[PDB]
Structures are given as structure tokens and as C-alpha cells.
Assembly symmetry: D3
Homo-oligomer: 247 residues x 6
């Protein structure tokens, strides 16, 4: 009933699909697929909910990764085994630049590797870089609908809290490595924080797979640590139109 | 009304609970809670399904972490904010040692940190060590039900595939770091691979929180229903001793 | 300080004439060659490995300035050019391909680099990506299409050495340190296209300081192929790649 | 002599499989004299070794000297001769305000601020004590009623800069260790010593059992250098009683 | 035409020479060669300008390295391929000790490896140490020439700016690693900053080649960021090593 | 006592500013007896100290014990007492085929395969000897005409795995040191010992002068352990020239 260990999918389920949009939240999978033709549920196991749809007569996959590089690495590997060669990540993010605002769209060229899983594919010297065609499709999709878009570097962390230098926590402390880190990333022109791109981008770029990253800003970190739908469907429109250009 | 960002929980929802059993799978949460008194669902958001139960008159939490350290680190942190001081991880695992059989139970004293999230709490030099009281309770709970128990070191990987030196993959490649690594860990007496303990154990030991881990052996790299059941019985009985 | 705003280059802001883009080759001797593809080229200065020319491209001032070999001298050039007012840097180089199906004469556009250098660490920790600017990479790819080249786009290994860091054994010692033993096979398996010696420094220092940087190179040798092209290894292939960097510069002014 | 440094043969051990390993060669006789039939074996460099009897079974007392390097020599050569269990008894400086001078500390695992541990396992490997050894130490501490704390110990290759002592010739502490004591204090680290990271790592990665017990001779929240027999006695009584349980 | 990929030299060009003086600046190669007998220009390609000369009847090479370890590693390797076994570097430097003056001559015993190229020959644990005979010749040559000389450790950086903790820059900031680094090296007794010695000394010491390092102080960094005995010393030292 | 470990006051030194520092406490008396007016000062742990006189000037002989940690204590506390120059005399295993047992090896700088050196300076800092001390050692070796080799030493925190010895309890060497001896050998490294990296780093980064000399007792291209005076004579003569 399955060709892979976790996803609960066969090659036949994909119907020859070579592109997957990979959100974090299993609940957003249906919402992304509903914007394409002939959307249908495939499987749901753990944090891995998968749907198949169609764009311009070509099969497309939407599959959730869950939170973090570890679960992402499972999803991407098992989709690759099934035939997916192009991965488009759609996520939510916290901006660290003063002039990147809530509701803005961010396209990641490459990520700061503040994760562990990327090291299981390539040494730290290797860049967590997005594919050129994917990044191009994402930027061009963003411009076609008139989104406020920033293109550049993202910091990709294995934690929501200390690795993103949040202090409103149980301990209230941040380990030496990350103490004063956000200001440093800010000075280096890093746009934002998320949790999956370093793993996704490194594992694709070091294994002959294409990957792209687009995200909607839901909090600005120069203002607050914790965020307070419209930003969602903005970036979701982008990832689907970008997918159309990559089939 | 939620006090935390991900778990969708308030401090009131815990009803004074100070201990949590933390399985990986959201679907396993109810199964663990059903072994205790007055089980009720609290919340379900993404990979974080939380139930509350009662054990000898005291409230306990059962909450899933999802796969991997990042997701675990969110669950543990937010449960700690809500008042949880003790964390008991329960799971099923493979084995990398020939002498460990399918049906044996593993109690982890400390973990090899093949993860990234642990480094966000303490530098690599810091040991990913389990709490002594927790480990004791798990060992003595295992001995009380007659389980064949192995106590020692676990390798905690950020990946299911290359970090556990699996070649049956898309690339068929394992990066230099992990090339020949399983045989290395085997020679060092490492019992098994899993994917959450390095993060759990490091973040707890470096923040004044108690943590332990028990796991049932369901497969062996070198070489059923009851094994799952035994490991759960052990973790619930261990919880009784730590309340 | 004989009319210089900077320590090494021997240049003033007036020399730039409002220029905000620089083409940065490695060889001082190639600077005149690159400027010759533009309007009204004039020599500005020559100090150490830093030879610089100003030219005009579609009516706009542009700088060509050599970096020398390696991250250290590249870091001096880029920094002092930034002090002078340059915000966009386009590196044109020669390279040895490591993939069997990238042929001699092919053009390579670098999206990002494996940091086998030391100078990039002086600008950002290793975790930071040695990534090229999107607009620069776009301009190079589009220009490659305008010229009509066989072009490959992807990752480059940027080494602090020509010999052991590129796993060459044809050396005095004949040995390669543990770190780089079997490294070329590893990079090949990771889809890395080629070796050069400046991009990791250039890309990291620009991306971490609000400067735009692109990287393009002509393939003059393939490490997997027995046949090594005649002494003019550079010549015709380099002219092809040089035409692309100049055409790319037009779209970034 | 079967071993290069210790000057011992397999016959000298008389089938002994457990060793109590103090730091000071001058402490070896005093520990052996607490057991039955104490006999001197050898004395070379900082390695003074004695044999004794505990409930009819041969036990070894062998000094390690200061630090992991000399500790690693003693442990290895003792392992070559047949020892499978090592119980370290030491002196320590507490860094938590609540641990008093004369208290007893049982180490579950160590912060690896040494170099020798890396010669047996990479840094990712835990410098963790054996569960049975640790249990024996904790329970022996309960039986004599000593004020005991159980937890993590920072194991340093230096007495001075690595334990953030400033009252030195240079008065300098390298960046790595600047502010490090406060960091360890916040992480719940009980104390500093100089041998356990090496001992615990080399044993846990080679199938050997190791425990660690120590007496507190100074509290670092008060002073850098210690000023008294009451401290040593309890700790030494614990290690001998723990050895009984592990034969 | 050339037996090496970059320098544009044949083995015959060297005329049996086994020692090279290796300055950073190609423009200063002629100057150094002019101090010896029978100076003859050999080649000029990229940052590599080379001259041959004679010293007490023996052939010697002067060959520039350009700025930094990578270009230095090229020059040294290819010169080694052509038979050179001893390398004497002469450079300029910024002193970081208050007692070291502009015009003073610094002889390097070993270098702090703030470069990347050294790691391509030996792991970081390996010392960037100078050859004992070369260091001795430089110290004795300094006595012969007459200069205020200091002997000790040098910090060798892959950058002129952030790695030497310079703030007179475009960004005016320094990465975490190098924030407060100069005063740290200062307290550790490090004499000076340059950009080639770590690569040179490591690659030579780990490959059976002999290397020495001498430099003239052009700026004192306890005072400011912005800035011929050394030359006479390197030539005299070469006399002693033939 | 002015210091915590050595059991000495500044008075015990009689104005001595140079120390010869062997590893074996049993060796201290033997070295001091080669000089004038030898007097025992103290013996605590692995730290046996004697005072002697050389050309009418007070000199200290003090043992370090084995390894960087104990060496770092001896050097630091001697520095506090007034010593500014340290000459280490050790025993060593050669790794080059043409170095004979009994040969004298003078260390210019050391490969830092230790941990204690990092407590004084980051890894980038060279474990280099003092020029005057090295010169005195080389020139002293020349004077008595001993077979001498000058160069780089590998200084290891272990005797066994870090020096790639396989005739051990486990018979294994961690990945980092597998094939390491061949690598050091190809790099021209002369020998292995266990103290110089720490000694040389801590002195060079703290304004103290240090020299390093050793006698070869085994050749590692032939055997791991030997079957089981010139270097000693050289260290005493070198000390004469540094007063
Ligand atoms: C041909 C060539 C040029 N430049 C490099 O860095 N490597 C190479 O192989
Ligand atoms: C062994 C030891 C004793 N006392 C301390 O304060 N620190 C140590 O490391
Ligand atoms: C070569 C050089 C000269 N002056 C400096 O201040 N730094 C350097 O690196
Ligand atoms: C001290 C010593 C002697 N002999 C060796 O072979 N190695 C060492 O480290």
C-alpha cells in the first residue's frame, strides 16, 4: 500500500508528478491544492498530509513537512524516492529588518544554517542555496500580482525560541552562541527567521533536486517576539503561480 | 485565551500538573492517557495533541512532540511555561546492537547529540544526560513488569536516513561525517537510534528540568503489539514514582 | 596618498565619475581586455595586483578592477571599491569544471559557493551562505542567452588553494591533507560544477554588507577529461565569458 | 611488568575487577587501609597502586594524577589488566550557592572541557557515568546520611583559566572561558573538577563502568582558592561502600 | 616557455637557485634584486613578478606573492616545483604592541593562523612555525644591518580590514569573531598583523621546505589604523642560508 | 605556602627565575644533583620541587606530572612564585625512521593535540617555543656534540589512541586519530609527547619563555612500546646560558 516508510504513498498516487509544494502545516495542504485543478486527498500520516492536484494538465503534489528540519528531511527524501524533483516551500515568518513589514512576501535566495539536519547532507561550507529557476518563478509570480516583495537571505533555526533569540521564555536565557545574534543577522542583511529552509535547501542543492522558498511575514521582530489568513492566501497565490511556471 | 503560541493551552488547563509524558505521535496520546484516571482531551494543534489525566490524585499531561528536536523543543518549552517540570519520553525504536532483541526495553542515560536544537540550549561539550530520578523510576518500573531492560547511550539523529547511515535512499549517498558512523557507535556501546532525545535531554538538563526516556525495541538493524504496550506501562508506572 | 581615497587601489571618487558597478576579474592583465568591450575605456591606476579602468556602458560610468588571486586580495579590492561608491560587483573568471558533461567553452553562472576559503569567515560565520545577488544572477543568465552560450547554473567550490584544496596531486609534496582527500568526488556527487578561488569571499562579503554580487566563469579545463585544450585555454572561452559579464552589466545600471 | 606506566602484572591484581581511582598518590594507601589485607603493589611517577580486599574480593586503589591525560593512562593500563569498573573519588569546588563545603557530589555526566575525551569519542558523545555505579554511590551516600547532590559536573583541563580564576600571574582568561562559570551556574552545573570528562567518556565508549563521587572543599561563589578532614572522610566512606555493592 | 601554470618560469630560468626571497608587491621585486649581483628579469604574470640574481656566486630568486595566502600558496608551490627549498618572506606590517615603533623590524617565530589556505596543508592544530635556521639567519642579519628588532608571534589575517579589527571601513563594523580581537592578541604578546605568513609558514613546515619571515613596521595600531632595513636584512639573511 | 598545589613560598626560590621542568617527580632529585647546592623544597601530588645553583645563581627543578592539566598547574604556580623561563625536559617516541633511541629532539613548535592549550589561546595561536630558549638548547646540544634533531612535535592528551597505538584494551582508535601518525610523519613531525603544546602555548601567550627538549626512548615506525642522559646534560647547559 506504500512505496515509502512514512508518507503512506506509492508512485502511482503521484500520477507522474515531479513538483511538490511543501507547506509546514498539514491543515494548509487542502487550501493550497484547492487553488489548482482536480484536487484530491492522498494520505495523512503523522505531520505528513498529502494532496494531488493538476496545473495545465500536469500533476502536482502538495505535502506538509511539519515543524523542523528532521520531519522536513523525511518528507523531501520520500517524495524524491517517489519522483519529485522540484520542491516549493511556502511558510510563515518573523521579519528582523525594520523595513520588512507584516504582510510582505519574502523569497529566499539562500539560508543561514542554524539547523542540524543540513549537516547530514553536506558540510557547513556548502551553501543552503535555492534553485535559480524556482527563485525566478517565485519572484516573477510575486511581481505579477503586485505583492510587496523582498529577495534575500533567511536565517533558518532549529528552535522557535533561543535560536531566534527570544527571551520571553521559561529560563529567560539564551545560550552564548545566540546571545546578540539577531542584531548580527540584522546587520548582515538577513531578512527573517523560519525553521525549515536550511534543511530543505541544503538537501536539494547537494542531491540534484530543485528547491525554492516563499513566505508571508506575520510578525516584525524589531517590534515584538510573538505574533498577534490574508497574508497566507497572498503567498499561497504566489507559490501556485510559481509552480505553474515550473511544470 | 491561550497562554502559549503553539500548544493552544492555558495554565488552568493543566490543573496543577507538573509532569508530562511526551510521545512523538499525536495518535498515541489518548492511548497513554487512557491508562490513567479521568482522561480528557485539552487541545490539538499541528503535531501537538495534549490530554490531561489523573494518577494517584494528581494531574498529569500527555502531549505529543512530533518528529525531531525542533518540534520537541517547542512542546517542552511551552509546557515548561505552563508549569511542567518533569518530562518522560516514550517511544518505539530499532536497535544497532546484536544482543538487543525485539521486545526488550531501553532506558537512556544520555544521548549522542547528532541534532541541531540541543546546541541552542548548551554548547556541544554539555552532556545530553537524563535526570537521575527519572531514569531510576524507568528502570525500576521496567524491572517491576519483568521486562528485559538495557540501560545506556542512545544516538539521537536529526535525520531518519543519512544520520542513521541509511543508503537505501534517493541519492544512495551518506555525507563524510556519517560514512561508517553506525559501526563506530556500535563499537562505543550505543544501543539505538532515535530522533528527539538529544534535544529533550539537553534542554531539560541545562534549564533545571527533569527528563527521562524509555523505548520499546520493535526492530533490529543487525538482525509487536506487546512491546508498545510494555513500554507504555513502564512510562506510566515511572510517572507514579516521580509525582 | 598621492591623490587616493583608499589605501591600496590608488583611486578617488572622482575617478569613478558616478560609477556604481564594477567588473572584477582576477588577472590585472585582463582589465584592459574587459574595458575594451565598452565605451571610451581609460586606465585609472595600477598598484600591486590592482589594475583599474573606467569605461562607459550605455552612457553610464563603469569600473573594471582586478582582484588578484584569492579571497584576501579580493576583499581589499571590493572593500575599497565600496568605500569609493560601488554597490554592484560582477566577477568574471576562468574555471576548471568537475562534472563530466560540462564541456570546455561552457559558461558557468554561480548561485552560491562552497566556502573553502578563510576570508569569508572575516565577514560572516560559516553558517551564512556565500550566495549571489538575485538581480546579478538574473542579468548573467539572461546575457548568456543573448550571447548564445552553453550555460550551466549552480554551485561552485571556492578554494583558498589551486592545488591541495582542489585535490591536485601533481605537486611538490604529492600529498593532500585529510580534509581534502577524496573531496573532489564528494563535491561532484553534490552537484558542484567547478573550482575557482575568489567567489566565496566576494559573495559572502557582499551579501553580508548590502552589496550586490554576481559570478560568471568560462570553462578552460575539465578535471574529468583527458584532453587539455591548447595554451589559449583561456583566450576564446574567456572572450565568450567576458562578453556575457559586460552584457549582464548593462541590465544592472 | 605487563603495563608500561603502572608497573603491574595481571597476577598483582589477584583477579580484581574494580578499581577506586583517587587523584593523589598519597591518598591511595589511606583508602586501601579502610579495606581488608591492604598491600602495596607499585609506585611509578604519579601512579601509586595498592591491592585490598572487600568482602573476600580483591579491589585496586590506583592514583590517576591531575587531569585527563594521566587519568587515561591509568584507566587503560588497568583495563588491560582486567579492571572493568572504575570509581573516582576526588576533591571539588562547588559553583552553586546552595552546595556547602563538606557536601558530597555524585556526577551523572560531565561538561567536556578537556581534550583527552575527544581521543575516545567525538564531542557529541556524552561523558555519562554508568547507571549501576551512580546508583551505588547515591545509595551509599544515603546509608551514611551525607548531604548529597546529584547532577552535572564541569570537567576542565585547567585549574585556573578553565575554571575562570582571575587571581593568576596573567590575570587573563581567554574569550572561550570569559563569563563561563556564570553560564555553567545557570545551566545547573554543580561543580568543577579535572578528570571526570576523560574518565566517563573513555569508559562509556569502551564498555567499562565508571562512577564519580567528590567532596566539596570550596564554594566558588565565595572564593577562588580553598582554605577540613570532615569533607574527605564522608566522600571516601561513600566510594568504599559503593564498591561493596558493585563487586 | 613555462614549466609551471602561473609564474611563467622554466627550471632552467632559476640557474640552480634553491632559495627565493618572496615579497608581496611585484613592483618591489626589481628593487630587492638590484641589491644583489647580476640581476636579471625573468617573468611578470598576474601578481607574480620574478627576477634572478647572484649572491656570493650563487643563484637566488626574488618573486612576488601578491597579497594573501592563496596567491602566496601558488608562488611557493610552483617555485618549489622548480627546485626552491628555502623561502624568505619580506613584507610590511602593522604593530599591535605599544613598545614597537614605526621603522622597527619584526622577525616571526610563528603565526596565529587567521587564514584559510594554511588549512589546505595542515589542520589547525599544526603550528605555523618558521624554520629555525631561517629565523636565526634573519635575527643575525638584523644585528649585522643595525635595526631595532623584535622577535615573536605574528597574527596572519585573510583580510586587511575586519580580521585586523579595522573600523575605517564601509560598514564600520566587525564580525563577532574579530570584535575585540586586536587587544586579545595584544594581551597574548602578539607583535603584529600581516597577511601571508600563516599560509607560508604552515605549507613550508608541513612539506619539508624552509621558511623565514621578516617585516618592517609601517604603522602602530595602538596609535592609528591608517599608515629599507627589512630589505637589507632579508638579503643578508639569504647570504647565510646558501 | 604562597600557592595551592606546589607547597612553596617565594623564599624557597632564593630569587630563581628559571625552572627546569621534567615530567617524573622521581627524576627531580637526579637533575638537581647535577648542579651545585641541591636542596629539596617540597613534594605534593606529582609535584616534587628541588632548588639548585648554576654559576652561582639559583635554579628550580620541578616535576609536571604527565599531561597538560598538571603541567599547567606547575607552570602557573611557578610563575606566581617568580619563574619567567621554563625549560621542559621530557621523554618521547620518535615517528621518523632515522631518529635513534637516545637522540635529542629540540621542539620549535607543537601540534596541539591537547585540550589545556585552548584554555590560554584559541587553536589558531601557535604552540611555539621561545627563540632564546630554543637557541640555548640547540647551541648546548652542539657543545656536547649529541645527535640532535630540531623541528615540530605532536603533543597529545593521550598516550594510546591520540598517538595511534592499537595494542590496547579496545584495539580501536577514534576516527580523528585513525591514520594520524602517517599524516604527522609526512608533515615532517619528529615525535610524540604529552606536555609541550600546553607548556608552549600558555607561556607564549602570557609573556613567559619556554624551551622544550626530549630524549627518544622508542621508535614508533618499529614498535608501540619500548623493550626497556644527553638530553639532560643539554637542558642543564642550556639553563646556564639563560640566567
Ligand atoms: C583551470 C583553473 C583555474 N582556476 C582554478 O581555481 N582552478 C582551476 O582548475
Ligand atoms: C580538582 C579540583 C579541586 N578544586 C577545585 O576548585 N577545582 C578542581 O578542579
Ligand atoms: C601588509 C600589511 C601592512 N600593514 C597592515 O597594517 N596590515 C597588513 O596586513
Ligand atoms: C611521554 C611519551 C613517551 N613515549 C611515547 O611514545 N609517547 C609519549 O608521549
Amino acid at each position: 500500500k506504500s512505496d515509502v516508510f512514512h508518507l503512506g504513498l506509492t508512485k502511482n498516487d503521484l500520477q507522474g508528478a515531479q513538483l511538490a509544494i511543501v507547506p509546514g502545516d498539514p491543515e494548509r495542504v487542502e487550501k493550497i491544492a484547492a487553488l489548482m485543478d482536480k484536487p484530491v486527498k492522498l494520505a495523512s500520516h503523522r505531520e505528513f498530509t498529502s494532496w494531488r492536484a493538476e496545473l495545465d494538465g500536469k500533476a502536482v503534489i502538495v505535502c506538509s513537512t511539519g515543524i523542523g528540519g528532521p520531519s522536513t528531511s523525511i518528507a523531501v527524501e520520500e517524495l524524491a524516492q517517489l519522483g519529485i524533483r522540484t520542491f516549493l516551500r511556502i511558510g510563515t515568518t518573523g521579519a528582523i529588518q525594520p523595513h520588512i513589514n507584516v504582510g510582505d512576501v519574502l523569497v529566499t535566495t539562500a539560508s543561514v544554517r542554524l539547523d542540524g539536519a543540513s549537516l547530514h547532507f553536506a558540510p557547513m561550507e556548502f551553501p543552503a542555496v535555492a534553485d535559480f529557476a524556482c527563485t525566478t518563478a517565485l519572484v516573477e509570480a510575486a511581481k505579477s500580482i503586485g505583492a510587496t516583495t523582498h529577495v534575500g537571505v533567511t536565517a533558518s533555526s532549529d528552535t522557535f525560541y533561543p535560536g531566534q533569540e527570544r527571551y520571553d521564555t521559561y529560563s529567560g536565557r539564551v545560550v552564548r552562541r545566540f546571545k546578540g545574534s539577531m542584531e548580527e543577522w540584522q546587520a548582515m542583511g538577513v531578512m527573517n527567521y523560519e525553521m525549515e529552509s536550511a534543511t530543505l535547501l541544503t538537501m536539494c542543492a547537494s542531491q540534484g533536486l530543485r528547491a525554492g522558498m516563499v513566505a508571508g511575514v506575520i510578525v516584525n521582530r524589531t517590534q515584538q517576539e510573538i505574533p498577534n489568513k490574508q497574508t497566507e492566501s497572498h503567498a499561497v497565490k504566489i507559490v501556485v503561480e510559481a509552480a505553474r511556471r515550473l511544470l
